[PDB]
Write a protein that binds this ligand. Structure first.
Ligand code: MTA
Length: 264
């Protein structure tokens, strides 16, 4: 609400700085992500404080991982498309920059499927599936801290019946030829996980494969590379779909490819 923020802060800021105040922000649970121009640095705390008041949030992080500008408690529960996502906003990446994809996941699975989430996080991609798809889900998350939330989110959504969780590196995962669908929501050279994926996959399984490719190499990549690694195993793969996502600089998109693999 500009007027109120303006009314309060104009009382302490040069009108010149006033004009520069944040016009937008991101909100996650009761935590605010707030972007700030350089020339406002001296006043950052007071600014975050009044925005906290009028926007009704407990804590403010700098949007620009994140600097604490006001408050202390960065844990919160964020509700999206009917799903409760508990997280620690400061320590765990989560962005409505990717809400479309989480919505999509709500519309892909059939209740029979076994799905394996190789980079579960707090359940970003898997929860939508366990709730709307009604399919079974095994979810793997390496970080013990992240893992706590993943677990908690399973209860918060009343799916503990059809969704399990392991705090381990996906590489050490025992299952093989068990997955009808695989989630690979990771972006740091995800291609190094293709082999384990192919191992976990059943013949014909669908894989949601995320990664970050320079647009220079598009649309050859990232598929070519996926294709060739798969060849190393005598398996074949068909590209069903390629969506672009949080395309981000410099010069590299974040894409997701929907692929089917054939174990011959
Ligand atoms: C939240 S999006 C990416 C997620 O995958 C997790 N992750 C990264 N590498 C692995 C791995 N090798 N096995 C299981 N989870 C992983 C991260 O800790 C994070 O929560």
């Amino acid at each position: 609400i500009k007027p109120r923020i303006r009314e309060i802060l104009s009382k302490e800021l040069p009108e010149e700085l006033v004009k520069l105040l944040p016009k937008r922000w991101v909100r996650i649970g009761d935590v605010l992500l707030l972007p700030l121009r350089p020339e406002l640095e001296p006043y950052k705390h007071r600014i975050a404080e009044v925005y906290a008041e009028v926007l009704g949030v407990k804590t403010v992080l700098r949007k620009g991982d994140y600097e604490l500008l006001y408050g202390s408690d960065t844990v919160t529960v964020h509700v999206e498309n009917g799903i409760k996502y508990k997280l620690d906003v400061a320590k765990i990446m989560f962005s409505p920059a990717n809400v479309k994809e989480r919505v999509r996941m709500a519309k892909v699975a059939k209740p029979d499927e076994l799905v394996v989430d190789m980079f579960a996080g707090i359940g970003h991609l898997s929860l939508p599936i366990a709730v709307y798809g009604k399919a079974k889900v095994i979810a793997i998350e390496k970080d013990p801290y992240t893992f706590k939330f993943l677990v908690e989110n399973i209860h918060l959504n009343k799916v503990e019946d059809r969704m399990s969780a392991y705090n381990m590196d996906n590489r050490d995962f025992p299952g093989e030829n068990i997955a009808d669908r695989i989630l690979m929501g990771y972006v740091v050279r995800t291609h190094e996980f293709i082999p384990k994926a192919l191992s976990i996959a059943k013949d014909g399984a669908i894989i949601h494969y995320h990664n970050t490719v320079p647009e220079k190499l598009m649309p050859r990549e990232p598929f070519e590379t996926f294709k060739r690694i798969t060849k190393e195993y005598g398996y074949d793969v068909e590209k069903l779909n390629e969506l672009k996502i949080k395309r981000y600089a410099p010069g590299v998109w974040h894409v997701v490819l929907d692929l089917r693999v054939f174990k011959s």
